[PDB]
Design a binder for this molecule. Structure first.
Ligand SMILES: OC[C@H]1O[C@@]2(CC(c3ccccc3)=NO2)[C@H](O)[C@@H](O)[C@@H]1O
Ligand SMILES: OC[C@H]1O[C@@]2(CC(c3ccccc3)=NO2)[C@H](O)[C@@H](O)[C@@H]1O
Lengths: 810, 810
């Protein structure tokens, strides 16, 4: 149908059809008489998977022959989403498969909806890892993603009576056609035990053993025939485990629980033993695999020349003392040499500055679980503090601030401090965030080792986040400037010369309307909810958290409702306000915010006076597959975190690429987005970081805003009195109390500017031509935010490798 | 190479080779450079599996079109062993695959050794189910095996310091290429809850739900293109299960533990809740599947015309009240009609008379777990006892003897009584056993309903137990009488005309010697143990149990050793005495017997005076795959249970088919084996059932035998004094105490006759020609013991269906 989806050659279509029928018969053991849509999905998945294998085998043998420096990306989260369409896109098979299935009497888009998301992440951090894998393959890097194969990913969210309910994400129930189990490469991981000092160094003895079984998933690059590997570890009990008899076999579950479930916390540290086990599990198995591969290429001096390890936050921070353990205890290297190798191998990316998100593990937990690692951490700390004392003589408070060991009620290890000490590079994820690291939380470390600190602004892959989810937009762009931009997003700047082109203006607006119609239809079919496709689609999708200020959005919504009720016969620009996202199960306030949103919808959506002028919808079960649907349909992107709290954001970049305008604070990557597009083409409002600092010095008093803003007072009175919960008048008392007395994120302080800015949004929307021209200026300057740009920077500035767009032979 | 293994056509070999390479590439994602023997096994398995699928699909659609009466074989155990060779044999692909792999530079027999046994059974009962499935497919019956997919089958046995150690049988670790998961046919199973009586009957409410997910395995018939199904259920938690959050997901293990592990008890009842859950799990899921299939063909009058359910012992006895529950509570049939349907549908096979093996479930367990079933059982009991009271007026003791409910300290349900009441046919598994049922334990029931009681003598499949494991013997037979006997074992009678044929005598003895050499080589390669291939191979392989009297064998071994030591320079016929089998982990005495055997070996095997004249070996990890190796190598089959204790035995039949002579008591199927071959061609010794009865009336006094047999006294003195355990003098005190004071199985009573009979064995072995002539007379009369004969009898006399040898189109 459309050009960017590739060719549908006679030979290819015929071959795909026959292989489809072969898989339905031999693989699925079905015939067309009893086959269901799900069977058809699997037949298609297996057919497409077959096209990966040749490239996968030859890519890995190419790396063995060429022996390039290998990049190891360690993460506890990989938020992959669906794989079928992405694979077709990267292999140029989409049109061919569409044709093949059409000739078989099937709709491919219907089949695509059957695939479960691989939801092995919480949100932004996990999704960044996924975009990074795509970019590393597209840039021809010898890269490996290493993580945990959770049996249960991020929970499925159901809304019942306006409240969030959780259910297990049983994503493997029907099988996973993309993974290949590699039981032959199973490795042992050790826990507990004790340290024994001998004539020849320390020995870690009397341990409990859990097996790590790898599953490999192919990661195809964009049309370059490169297929890299994501290797995820699954926990297995040894066969002599606990070996009455029956109970001993049943108790194998205890060991295998390590890889059972993803911790559902976004930007929050929960210091549970099971989580610590998960972190060591991935680190220990991965490092053995790295060292094996290095030996199968004695001389560890060349280790850093052949190996780079990237730590995705502090979650895999145990890589540092584990590498030291292996080099010192097992390979018999002297400390100083082992440390040199470790530092040159490891690099650390920090993803947040929120105090409650930082990992600080109780010493007593590490003492019991990982006694040798604690000893190594103590030794690292002593040697590091000796360096600090030499550089800043007599500065005793600096020594306590910089220590890896934190004293107090319970002694803890600061894992961020461990990572900085043991890495040759430390980066933040947006310019403002990286500067905040150097000025505040890691100031002492920056003063000691300035050369270590870098910035690498986040990005998103234009394959999934444009070509896959928005083929209509991809096509109208390709018609004007060709296809090269898909792997060279900076080429979108060429669209600036079309900002006054009447045909292009029409096409951009047409594509948006089509996306909106499609999404409006999706909502009716799957959720029986009714929306006006002519209204402004006002969208805030992201995890529910106080810092992200879904509450500020709620206040604007109520403001709009109240204004309509005050003057019903006055024209307002119609809006559909959509808010979606999951709350961590133990996060009471986030769960209350969800209930508030649905409660507002209950009132607003059923008020006859409002009509189709304002609709409030909570988008249930927000996840990668839903993002791919709603983002292309959005007009307005809500990026409204308190300045200094959102390290980067990546949802923001997705909306910019897909033709939505942004209302946002100068926070995270919003700052660079506004810089790229020009501030005139962005809806910027609210406090800057400096303004937040000034308010903190003075003391934030929410009562002041309540007293001076009559429209705000009305909303608080409505919430308190039970206007949005008539049968439970005091339901939202916790929300009101927090807003009035202990709001860490200063919701009231940005209210007036926000509402004012939103009026400017509505004004522009009344002028479709000028709205679209501003959209074009956003799309055209979105190039910087390709993860290809991000990865090229990591490659050149941290890993010491050169990216390549050269094809491997097919 | 050999004729019975089929043709190796040019087209077939070329096609097998290309499909092998295809699977290695696309399925296994390997190339010849990094592939291991295990990869080669899987490539072969997938290649052979492909040949099943067409036949599997067309067989099942044939049953849908023809709508024949369906046979449902319900068992908690299916001891399948390996599948690769069996599939090749039944599809006539063995020679072709041998050629194909040979041309690829691989040895097929090496690849076959990589496959794990499917060890989903304990021994005889589970293996009978497996032979039955093979025969049902070969006889063209619309048959389905239903059971549980245990994650862990019968434990792997390791011998450490002469003691049995257990380890988990992780048989699914590398995957199972033979099964097809059918998650789309998942069914709910209910537990606990309570019974609510309404205006319209009883309702079972507030239950806990566990999901039953089916996995289908193909069961090919012998060269008839029929492929039946074995459907095994796996336990799954519902997604809202227990839905802090993390613990709730972790607690899913509790539900899924139902299908985790096989209870390792042979002929012993353990009244544990988990086992009861397993029994209901298989019954509830299976019955829903049966009823669905019946409806997809309102009128339950025709149910028994279209459905037969065979209960493999009392383990699936809950089928009776479950069927009543569904018909009465759900389908709204009146009691009397539902009962008529149930009785005509169900039939029960009893497999043992040992009191400790009979299932008697505590009422309190059924009350809590299955409240509605208990109510139904009570109602069945009341109506049944009303019938008994009408037939035998005033006989109050009969009423208490026949009751399904047993009174006492704890009230129990006698599941055997339930099965007799609710079945139209009840059978034993050998003529002597079936007669014992009518005369003793079920005498009261036989008097009430004589027409119900039948015999169906057990059998073994000649495919696995001759063609597969002993191709050399199969071939020399085929050379004389053709190939028809493989599916018509009665044709072996034609070999009687070759008992004086000098060429045949030579060939039979040659095949045995070759098998012995091969097995002697296997022992050296895998266990580094050394044996004389010229010695008499004296073999007792079976589960370790007091009733099977491995101890009697031990006494003979020590007798032989003592006689050699008394007269070292006297010639004796050299023997290799091999004993193997697993002990249930909680069975102390059986574990002690294993230690005794190894302790005897430790003394006998290292005595320089003995030399190569006597060797005692414990065969580690006896299982189906080992049986296939050792049985063809055996000269003497030990079948020495106390008369009246071994219901049938099936190992006995395996040895008879493979050219071993039998030393045995007149117990189980031994009686019919001797009848078929002629008593002159069998080494019969010891008490008959009547002699055991006489001794019991008198009172068994072991001291009498000790006092009157000097050779026996010596052995007991050796055991007691510490001759076989110098460092632990009292190690075998429990064994001596049991033998002297509480031997339920009268080991001493058969000692003299046994030793005498063994002397006659040695005498015959000195004359190779006459030994072989007697062997020929055994092989020639083994036809009755084909499971094809057994299944044909079940079909005609119980199920009301006619077997067919007609081919389905390929
Ligand atoms: O760099 C990727 C993203 O990382 C974060 C940090 C984060 C996280 C998740 C789990 C644990 C700790 C931090 N999720 O999102 C940041 O909050 C977000 O701003 C950033 O875009
Ligand atoms: O019919 C098949 C076989 O059945 C038994 C009975 C049995 C068994 C196994 C588990 C639970 C209860 C009984 N295993 O073997 C009998 O002991 C054996 O004699 C017979 O050949």
């Amino acid at each position: 149908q459309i050009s960017v989806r590739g060719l549908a050659g006679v030979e290819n279509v015929t071959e795909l059809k026959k292989n489809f029928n072969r898989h339905l018969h031999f693989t699925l053991v079905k015939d067309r008489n009893v086959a269901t849509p799900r069977d058809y999905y699997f037949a298609l998945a297996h057919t497409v998977r077959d096209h990966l294998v040749g490239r996968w085998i030859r890519t890995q043998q190419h790396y063995y022959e060429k022996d390039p420096k290998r990049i190891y990306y360690l993460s506890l989260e990989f938020y992959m989403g669906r794989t079928l369409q992405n694979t077709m896109v990267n292999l140029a098979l989409e049109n061919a498969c569409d044709e093949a299935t059409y000739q078989l009497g099937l709709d491919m888009e219907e089949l695509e909806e059957i695939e479960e998301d691989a939801g092995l992440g919480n949100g932004g951090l996990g999704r960044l890892a996924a975009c990074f894998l795509d970019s590393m393959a597209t840039l021809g890097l010898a890269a490996y993603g290493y993580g945990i194969r959770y049996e249960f990913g991020i929970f499925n969210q159901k809304i019942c009576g306006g409240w969030q309910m959780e259910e297990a994400d049983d994503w493997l129930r029907y099988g996973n056609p993309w993974e290949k189990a590699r039981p032959e490469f199973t490795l042992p991981v050790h826990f507990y035990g004790r340290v024994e000092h001998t004539s020849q160094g320390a020995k870690w003895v009397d341990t409990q053993v859990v097996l790590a079984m790898p599953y490999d998933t192919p990661v195809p690059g964009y049309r370059n025939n490169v297929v890299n590997t994501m290797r995820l570890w699954s926990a297995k009990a040894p066969n002599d485990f606990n070996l009455g008899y029956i109970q001993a076999v049943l108790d194998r579950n205890l060991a295998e629980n390590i890889s059972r479930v993803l911790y559902p916390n976004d930007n929050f540290f929960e210091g549970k033993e099971l989580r610590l086990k998960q972190e060591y599990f991935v680190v220990a198995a991965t490092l053995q695999d790295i060292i094996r591969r290095f030996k199968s290429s004695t001389n560890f001096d060349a280790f850093p020349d052949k190996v780079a390890i990237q730590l995705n936050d502090t979650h895999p921070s145990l890589a540092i003392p584990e590498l030291m353990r292996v080099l010192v205890d097992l390979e018999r290297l002297d400390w100083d040499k082992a440390w040199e190798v470790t530092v040159k191998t490891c690099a650390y990316t920090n993803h947040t500055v929120l105090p409650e998100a930082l990992e600080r593990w109780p010493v007593h937990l590490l003492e019991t679980l990982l006694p040798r690692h604690l000893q190594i951490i103590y030794e690292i700390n002593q040697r590091f503090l000796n360096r600090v004392a030499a550089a800043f003589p007599g500065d005793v408070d600096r020594l306590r601030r910089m220590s890896l060991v934190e004293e107090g009620a319970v002694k803890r290890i600061n894992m961020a401090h461990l990572c900085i000490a043991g890495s040759h590079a430390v980066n933040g994820v947006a310019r403002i965030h990286s500067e905040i690291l150097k000025k505040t939380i890691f100031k002492d470390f920056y003063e000691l080792e300035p050369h270590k600190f870098q910035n690498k602004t986040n990005g998103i892959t234009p394959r999934r986040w444009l070509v896959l989810c928005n083929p209509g937009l991809a096509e109208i762009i390709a018609e004007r400037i060709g296809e090269e931009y898909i792997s060279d997003l900076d080429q979108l700047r060429k669209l600036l010369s079309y900002v006054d082109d009447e045909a292009f203006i029409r096409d951009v607006a047409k594509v948006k309307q089509e996306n909106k119609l499609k999404f409006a239809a999706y909502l009716e079919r799957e959720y029986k909810v009714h929306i006006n496709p002519n209204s402004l689609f006002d969208v805030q999708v992201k995890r529910i958290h106080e810092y992200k200020r879904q509450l500020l959005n709620c206040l604007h919504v109520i403001t709009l409702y109240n204004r309509i009720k005050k003057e019903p016969n006055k024209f307002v620009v119609p809006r559909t306000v959509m808010i979606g996202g999951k709350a961590a199960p133990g996060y009471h306030m986030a769960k209350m915010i969800i209930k508030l949103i649905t409660a507002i919808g209950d009132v607003v959506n059923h008020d006859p006076v409002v009509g189709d002028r304002l609709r409030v919808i909570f988008l249930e079960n927000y996840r990668v597959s839903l993002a791919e649907k709603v983002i292309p349909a959005a007009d307005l992107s809500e990026q409204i975190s308190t300045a200094g709290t959102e390290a980067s954001g990546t949802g923001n970049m997705k909306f910019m690429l897909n033709g939505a305008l942004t209302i946002g604070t100068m926070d995270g990557a919003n700052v660079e987005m506004a810089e790229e597009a020009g501030e005139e083409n962005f809806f910027i409002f609210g406090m800057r970081v400096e303004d937040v600092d000034r308010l903190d010095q003075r003391g934030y008093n929410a009562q002041e805003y309540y007293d001076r803003i009559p429209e705000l007072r009305q909303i608080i009175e409505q919430l308190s009195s039970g206007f949005f919960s008539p049968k439970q008048p005091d339901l939202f008392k916790d929300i009101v109390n927090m807003l009035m007395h202990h709001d860490r994120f200063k919701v009231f302080a940005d209210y007036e500017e926000y509402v004012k800015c939103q009026e400017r949004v509505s004004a522009l929307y009344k002028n479709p031509r000028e709205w679209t021209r501003m959209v074009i200026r956003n799309i055209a300057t979105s190039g910087k935010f390709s993860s290809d740009r991000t990865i090229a920077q990591y490659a050149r500035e941290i890993w010491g490798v050169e990216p390549s767009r050269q094809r491997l032979p097919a």
